Write a protein that binds this ligand. Sequence first.
Ligand SMILES: Cc1cc2nc3c(=O)[nH]c(=O)nc-3n(C[C@H](O)[C@H](O)[C@H](O)COP(=O)(O)OP(=O)(O)OC[C@H]3O[C@@H](n4cnc5c(N)ncnc54)[C@H](O)[C@@H]3O)c2cc1C
Ligand SMILES: NC(=O)c1ccc[n+]([C@@H]2O[C@H](COP(=O)([O-])OP(=O)(O)OC[C@H]3O[C@@H](n4cnc5c(N)ncnc54)[C@H](OP(=O)(O)O)[C@@H]3O)[C@@H](O)[C@H]2O)c1
Length: 537
Amino acid sequence: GNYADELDVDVLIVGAGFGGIYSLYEMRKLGLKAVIYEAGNDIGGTWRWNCYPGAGVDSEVPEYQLSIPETWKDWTWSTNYPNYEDLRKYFDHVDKVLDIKKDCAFNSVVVGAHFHTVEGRWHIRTADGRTARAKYFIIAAGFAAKRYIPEWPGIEKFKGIVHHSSFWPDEKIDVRGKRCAIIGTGASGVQVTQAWGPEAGELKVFQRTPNLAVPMRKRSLTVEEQEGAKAFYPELFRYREKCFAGFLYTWCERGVFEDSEEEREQFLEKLWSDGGFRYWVANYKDYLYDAKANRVVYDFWRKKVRERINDPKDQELLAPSEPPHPWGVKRPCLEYDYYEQFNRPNVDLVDIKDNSIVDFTEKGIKLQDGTEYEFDVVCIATGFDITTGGMTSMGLHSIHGDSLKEEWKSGAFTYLGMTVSGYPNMFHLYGPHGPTLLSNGPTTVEIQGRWIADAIKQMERQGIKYINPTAKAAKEWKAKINELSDKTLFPTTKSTYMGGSMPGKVFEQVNYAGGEYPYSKEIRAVLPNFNGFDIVK
Ligand SMILES: Cc1cc2nc3c(=O)[nH]c(=O)nc-3n(C[C@H](O)[C@H](O)[C@H](O)COP(=O)(O)OP(=O)(O)OC[C@H]3O[C@@H](n4cnc5c(N)ncnc54)[C@H](O)[C@@H]3O)c2cc1C
Ligand SMILES: NC(=O)c1ccc[n+]([C@@H]2O[C@H](COP(=O)([O-])OP(=O)(O)OC[C@H]3O[C@@H](n4cnc5c(N)ncnc54)[C@H](OP(=O)(O)O)[C@@H]3O)[C@@H](O)[C@H]2O)c1
């Protein structure tokens, strides 16, 4: 049925993660024939494929789920910060309540897409030779696309167990008493470090740049306290769409230097205590916008983290006097006992800032000054390539015949962070030029989801064949993306530290930095007239 060799649908969705599950939901309400092409065999996105030791949410319950009444009605969590196993069981519950799988074609890897302007339809080709033709094309393909491993020829030779964090196997590797390595101190590294520290015989963490990690206030939830709150879950889900990063909190109405030295200490203690990303996006409104303001947030962070690390050498490495970059310039890691792990005599932080990893060997890995380390298990928690999402990665072709990969070689150009000029009736959720990485995933998805479902609703009512963003509209959006980011302390091409900079492409801000509320207003302005689109009946 959904696996037919030439598939006729109104809507083709790529991905069965949050983005694809919510898009499918919205399409069913419009009464359109829709199908998800999913590369994998189950729904959940990153929560199925890209799981690793001690992986779980950094968003607090009930922030990280769908606002769909019927999905959370009889659902509760065991804890306020669930892990990947809890999330997997949540997606089973969403499938049991909505029957998502009925409209999925699994092991469907999209390798090509071209829009036939005369037909007014996408032809969407899978790796295994099937093709769907659809009026509307929705890409819920995620941002954790293109796992980044640096140029280490040796990996082939290494005798031990090695994987990138996002490719860690389902079947857990017993690391108890083994020599393990973690390369990277992003959320992935930090999460794995907390998981391996307690059990590994020896463990080495290879740190170029330290994580500016903030405390996770994890606790058990009862079914009772949750069922009690659900009176106002609807209001809560609406409140996150009013909040800068789409959590149940946003910026303090005050800037750093409206408060005294005592008032700051107390206010910052309160955010630290309360936990989550309050320190990141419930802090003084100007700390991401002014250097002196940033430094005050940094120093307090430095004080709190130093209290937890015994060795003065590790103290300096894990929380330096001089910031490696402005505080909160990248989504920090929500940690539980990261800093405690480096107090263990089996754990060892290695400074590679000036002494790069040259290559892997048979035994383990080797550095610039010729230092070698022998290992049994290595997790490569290096970056992703977020120059763009998995949008360039599925052979999307414009109506000018060029690939999106090609048209985006000098930098990404979307309109409203949901559409691309030369890709008519093509929509993306949780991708470039959306709140995306500066946001609660499910919040941004629902804002964007509702806009795509309205956009599609309007095209059906007004009798529109296709809409296509103008280069003028896309350039103006790019100008906006850059105007919001350039006010901030976010890295620029002139910055000494440019997190996730790559040889291939130029470095640029990829997310909308204006907040969920101003974003919602921007995208809402353009309906129902489709301002900035070529309209064809
Ligand atoms: C361990 C972990 C924890 C996280 N915790 C949080 C958190 O607490 N808060 C937060 O805000 N964000 C968090 N994130 C980020 C997370 O990626 C997003 O919040 C969200 O899960 C993305 O949903 P999505 O559906 O947009 O993407 P994904 O979940 O990545 O789904 C994309 C889907 O597209 C499919 N696909 C890709 N390419 C193709 C193709 N060519 N053809 C067909 N199918 C294709 C994939 O197989 C996948 O099913 C976390 C990520 C990880 C890995
Ligand atoms: N837990 C989560 O919520 C989660 C999970 C997955 C992804 N994400 C998102 O997607 C991104 C990926 O997160 P991540 O934790 O996997 O990794 P990351 O934050 O992208 O950082 C990877 C780490 O690897 C280091 N590194 C990169 N190349 C290296 C090299 N050649 N040699 C040595 N070290 C190297 C980086 O150092 P430098 O800092 O010096 O470059 C960095 O410490 C994040 O920005 C995050 O927002 C989030």
